[PDB]
Design an enzyme around this catalytic site. Structure first.
Site, PDB file in Angstrom:
ATOM      1  N   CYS B  65       0.814  -1.210   0.000  1.00  0.00           N
ATOM      2  CA  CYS B  65       0.000   0.000   0.000  1.00  0.00           C
ATOM      3  C   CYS B  65       0.859   1.276   0.000  1.00  0.00           C
ATOM      4  O   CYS B  65       1.677   1.501   0.902  1.00  0.00           O
ATOM      5  CB  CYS B  65      -0.964   0.007   1.198  1.00  0.00           C
ATOM      6  SG  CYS B  65      -1.919   1.507   1.311  1.00  0.00           S
ATOM      7  N   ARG B  68      -0.070   4.568   2.961  1.00  0.00           N
ATOM      8  CA  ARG B  68       0.060   4.324   4.397  1.00  0.00           C
ATOM      9  C   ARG B  68       0.419   5.555   5.216  1.00  0.00           C
ATOM     10  O   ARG B  68       0.436   5.464   6.449  1.00  0.00           O
ATOM     11  CB  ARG B  68       1.103   3.232   4.617  1.00  0.00           C
ATOM     12  CG  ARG B  68       0.610   1.867   4.151  1.00  0.00           C
ATOM     13  CD  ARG B  68       1.674   0.823   4.427  1.00  0.00           C
ATOM     14  NE  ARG B  68       2.667   0.694   3.345  1.00  0.00           N
ATOM     15  CZ  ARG B  68       3.851   0.110   3.507  1.00  0.00           C
ATOM     16  NH1 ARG B  68       4.196  -0.297   4.719  1.00  0.00           N
ATOM     17  NH2 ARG B  68       4.703  -0.043   2.469  1.00  0.00           N
ATOM     18  N   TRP B 237      -9.551   5.980  -0.272  1.00  0.00           N
ATOM     19  CA  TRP B 237     -10.002   6.509  -1.550  1.00  0.00           C
ATOM     20  C   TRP B 237      -9.133   5.945  -2.663  1.00  0.00           C
ATOM     21  O   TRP B 237      -8.063   5.395  -2.409  1.00  0.00           O
ATOM     22  CB  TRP B 237      -9.965   8.020  -1.576  1.00  0.00           C
ATOM     23  CG  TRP B 237      -8.596   8.574  -1.136  1.00  0.00           C
ATOM     24  CD1 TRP B 237      -7.458   8.628  -1.875  1.00  0.00           C
ATOM     25  CD2 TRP B 237      -8.271   9.066   0.156  1.00  0.00           C
ATOM     26  NE1 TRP B 237      -6.409   9.222  -1.124  1.00  0.00           N
ATOM     27  CE2 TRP B 237      -6.900   9.488   0.122  1.00  0.00           C
ATOM     28  CE3 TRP B 237      -9.023   9.283   1.333  1.00  0.00           C
ATOM     29  CZ2 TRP B 237      -6.260  10.060   1.232  1.00  0.00           C
ATOM     30  CZ3 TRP B 237      -8.368   9.861   2.449  1.00  0.00           C
ATOM     31  CH2 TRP B 237      -6.997  10.244   2.373  1.00  0.00           C
ATOM     32  N   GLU B 242      -5.728   3.310 -10.566  1.00  0.00           N
ATOM     33  CA  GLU B 242      -6.411   2.041 -10.352  1.00  0.00           C
ATOM     34  C   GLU B 242      -7.604   1.932 -11.278  1.00  0.00           C
ATOM     35  O   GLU B 242      -7.917   0.846 -11.760  1.00  0.00           O
ATOM     36  CB  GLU B 242      -6.845   1.933  -8.904  1.00  0.00           C
ATOM     37  CG  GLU B 242      -5.673   1.816  -7.915  1.00  0.00           C
ATOM     38  CD  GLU B 242      -6.233   1.754  -6.479  1.00  0.00           C
ATOM     39  OE1 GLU B 242      -6.442   0.615  -5.994  1.00  0.00           O
ATOM     40  OE2 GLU B 242      -6.428   2.823  -5.846  1.00  0.00           O
TER      41      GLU B 242
END
Ligand code: HEM
Ligand code: HEM
Ligand SMILES: Nc1cccc(CCc2cccc(OCc3ccc4ccc(N)nc4c3)c2)n1
Ligand SMILES: Nc1cccc(CCc2cccc(OCc3ccc4ccc(N)nc4c3)c2)n1
Ligand SMILES: [Cl-]
Ligand SMILES: [Cl-]
Lengths: 362, 362
Positions: B65, B68, B237, B242
């Site tokens: 991720c 973070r 979000w 993506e």
């Protein structure tokens, strides 16, 4: 104890090499010849055929290379007979000329005498045979920052650059026994360069960018069956992202994206405008257009990845394991648009192969 | 033997968690309470404080991720008190509403009762709480291919999709003891969607693309100190790539690049034109523009990578090791334009963390 390692590597290499070459029956006698030779001399000497195929295997095993479909057509030039600086220099000049081939780049390697007992015979200081100098003093940035340390080394040896952004470094290499390397200016008639223009945007030429035709990597070690050819410069042709996404774009390289944004007419103010991405695409379109317009070989990352898919299929059809380094195989532009991004690869190291070696300078 | 593993994980978790929370002195008594509880019951129950911090640690440890930086502001909703389908359904509905927050997305996790002795209490079948259905028959492609298997499962349970390209799947989950999952249509008033327009190219709306506001990942297991919360849906979000580089672009997803090329007015004929790259940039510019225009939170990969650099600096300043998965941290668009592409990361797995778990269906 040096020779015990060598014998083991030679057994593995000769077996595999003669197998691929359909000479499996000749394996037995050739190894005996090798074991005698090592006992007597401390080393052994590859045949022309073994040296050529071994250089080709080493490319086939280079996990980080997307270009490996063409491994078997490598043009291998055997210069193990070199003894003098003039012969080294002329063989380097010949490599440039024959690999350039008036723009129809011929993937070529020139192999010089290998390390004897880990002592080098010829020691090339250049990273690539053709590359631009770089300078940094008094806050002034000129040329290619990647070349700063070698450029400073060269200027200690009595060379002096014009301090354009695109000075060609001289060839620089050291012979065994000698204690400083020599340097020779490259004849400009041998060096093709490509000015960067854009197919649609006439203003792109205001950037006055250029790059050289042929990347000839001259600082890696070729290892074939336990013999260490530290001086074995080789070349392919460029994949366009190498120039457009790294050499001209990196903040630590020529750092041209803000100027690209300006000439293509977009603002460079907001991350959300994706101006860096847009500039990267137009710069990379300009690189491919310019190489093609001038008649210099180049490949785009989509075609390159398609070719690499064929290499993967060819490996499987031949019953050879495929190895690869995903982090180097994906291109730095639209990686998920290639099949590579969507699979994994075994990063195991198999030999023959090309390896890094310490630079002789700082 | 189940409880010996649990005791070890609980020691490591409580020590680290109370340490970070300045409650190190309370460590001793809390563990004794735990060891009695496990001896008696087979398990132990986290305090509100431990559950909240443990969910936050698990995000901080998610190597893949980039988001973070904001791990400590996760809004943790504790629903370990749920016992019925209506309560599960309503807590899922509430998660959607509170995490959406009229577009100002609030990173949220809802934690349901954990596995007892590896038997699940609630089993969510959705991959995300909000996601589009997908169909494949008779050569006809509709919707999201990633959703084909779940969509077919849902239509075995008496649901039926309108077979638009953007049917919302129903919530589907199974309760312990029950033997088929139930399903509930999502109230459309709770689901924000964003139509994709382009800032400059009015024709872009002819594509009639849209995506949903909030990605709420509902099929991973949260592990905190040996307790396995298999049902713990969470959301951040979106990062725009993506949607623009994967969901709408992948050949196995909505596969829209050729249509994007057409509406933006470029040819889609020659790899060397880099039309896929150019289309990817305009589609990703449209995604960011549309989310921002509608008032729905989103972040671009440049800003996201800048935030992640701050996370790396914060880790170092706090004396915590940084772990990361380079192959997932780099964005699929202009990766070398981010600092991530230019460093390496230790991919070690530390806990608390989120993990994959087998789907209950095929
Ligand atoms: C014929 C055209 C060729 C193309 C288009 C090509 C493409 C590339 C590219 C793009 C990289 C760097 C990937 C990255 O930056 O992530 C690379 C690495 C490499 N290529 Fe190739 N290549 C070609 C020919 C060759 C040849 C002829 C050899 C040797 C005989 C070779 C050996 C390698 C090696 C060893 C590396 C990795 C170098 C390192 O680790 O620093 N390639 N190739
Ligand atoms: C707040 C905004 C957030 C952003 C922008 C963000 C960004 C991302 C992205 C882009 C990925 C996938 C990377 C790729 O496809 O290569 C990802 C993976 C992940 N994120 Fe985040 N994220 C955010 C919030 C969260 C939250 C709140 C959690 C949990 C509390 C979380 C946990 C994860 C996990 C576990 C993965 C990997 C999933 C897997 O392995 O399949 N993220 N994140
Ligand atoms: N952060 C990062 C992430 C992934 C990969 C990389 C590598 C970037 C890089 C730096 C320097 C050189 C380089 O490549 C060397 C090379 C060797 C042989 C070639 C043969 C043909 C050809 N066309 N290119 C070649 C390039 C890559 N960095
Ligand atoms: N070939 C490849 C190479 C590298 C990485 C990948 C992963 C692509 C992928 C597929 C499916 C899901 C996914 O992400 C899951 C996820 C989890 C949590 C998130 C939290 C917030 C947020 N904005 N996104 C999240 C996404 C990645 N594939
Ligand atoms: Cl280069
Ligand atoms: Cl998604």
């Amino acid at each position: 104890e040096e020779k015990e390692i060598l014998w083991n590597e030679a057994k593995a290499f000769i077996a595999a090499c003669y197998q691929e070459l359909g000479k499996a029956a000749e394996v037995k006698d050739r190894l005996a010849d090798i074991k005698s030779e090592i006992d007597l001399t401390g080393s052994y000497v590859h045949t022309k055929e073994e040296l050529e195929h071994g250089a080709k295997m080493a490319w086939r095993n280079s996990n980080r290379c997307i270009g490996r479909l063409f491994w078997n057509s490598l043009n291998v030039i055997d210069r193990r007979d070199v003894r003098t600086k003039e012969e080294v220099r002329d063989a380097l000049f010949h490599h440039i000329e024959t690999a350039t081939n008036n723009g129809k780049i011929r993937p070529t390697i020139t192999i010089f005498p290998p390390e004897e007992k880990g002592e080098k015979q010829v020691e090339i200081w250049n990273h690539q045979l053709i590359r631009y100098a770089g300078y940094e003093s008094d806050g002034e940035r000129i040329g290619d920052p990647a070349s700063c340390s070698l450029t400073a080394a060269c200027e200690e040896l009595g060379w002096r650059g014009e301090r354009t952004d695109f000075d060609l470094l001289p060839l620089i290499f050291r012979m065994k026994g000698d204690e400083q390397p020599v340097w020779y200016e490259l004849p400009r008639s041998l060096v093709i360069e490509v000015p960067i223009t854009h197919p649609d945007i006439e203003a792109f030429s205001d950037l006055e960018l250029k790059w050289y035709g042929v990347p000839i990597i001259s600082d890696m070690k070729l290892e074939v069956g336990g013999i260490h050819y530290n001086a074995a410069p080789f070349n392919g042709w460029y994949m366009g992202t190498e120039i457009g996404a790294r050499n001209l774009a990196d903040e630590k390289r020529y750092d041209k994206l803000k100027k690209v944004a300006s000439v293509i007419g977009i603002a460079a103010d907001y991350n959300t405008d994706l101006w860096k991405d847009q500039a990267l695409v137009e710069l990379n379109k300009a690189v491919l257009h310019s190489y093609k317009k001038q008649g210099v070989s180049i490949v785009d990352h989509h075609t390159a990845a398609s070719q690499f898919k064929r290499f993967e299929e060819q490996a499987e059809e031949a019953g050879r394991k495929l190895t690869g380094d995903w982090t180097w195989l994906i291109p730095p532009i639209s990686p998920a648009a290639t099949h590579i991004f969507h699979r994994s690869y075994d990063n195991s190291i198999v030999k023959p192969n090309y390896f890094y070696q310490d630079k002789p300078y700082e």
